[PDB]
C-alpha cells in the first residue's frame, strides 16, 4: 500500500478559541487500501508509530491553511461530514513542497485514485 502523500507535521490542540501546537512532532501521510478507501494517518515522530488512522472519503473533509496567525505553516482539516476539525503544523525545513503536499492532501482526500 503506497502512500499517496507524506510530510512532516505535528498535531495541535484547540480549546475554546485558542490553538496551541503540540510538540509531539508527527508525520501526516495518506494511503489507499485495496478497499479504495483513503486512509488519513498521523504518526508520532517520537516512536514513528501511527497514532491516528481515519478513512477519509471524497468531499468528506477539506485540507486548508489557517490564516489566523501568520508566521509559520499551519493547516486545518475540516471534516465536511465529520463535523470535526483537526489542526496541524508543518515541521519540514523547506516549504518548497508544502504547497504540493497541501494540494496532494486535498486531492487524495477529495479525489481518491
Amino acid at each position: 500500500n503506497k502512500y499517496l502523500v507524506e510530510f512532516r507535521a505535528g498535531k495541535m490542540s484547540l480549546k475554546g478559541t485558542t490553538v496551541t501546537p503540540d510538540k509531539r512532532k508527527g508525520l501526516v501521510y495518506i494511503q489507499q487500501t485495496d478497499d479504495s478507501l483513503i486512509h488519513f494517518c498521523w504518526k508520532d515522530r517520537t516512536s514513528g508509530n501511527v497514532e491516528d488512522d481515519l478513512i477519509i472519503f471524497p468531499d468528506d473533509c477539506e485540507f486548508k491553511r489557517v490564516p489566523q496567525c501568520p508566521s509559520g505553516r499551519v493547516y486545518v482539516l475540516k471534516f465536511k461530514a465529520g463535523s470535526k476539525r483537526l489542526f496541524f503544523w508543518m515541521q519540514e525545513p523547506k516549504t518548497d513542497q508544502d504547497e504540493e503536499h497541501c494540494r496532494k492532501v486535498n486531492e487524495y482526500l477529495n479525489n481518491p485514485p
Partner: peptide, 14 residues
C-alpha cells in the same frame, strides 16, 4: 536542521 513549532494563537470560525 528542523524548524521550531509556532506560538499559540486565537482561532475564530469566521
Amino acid at each position: 536542521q528542523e524548524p521550531e513549532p509556532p506560538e499559540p494563537f486565537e482561532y475564530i470560525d469566521d
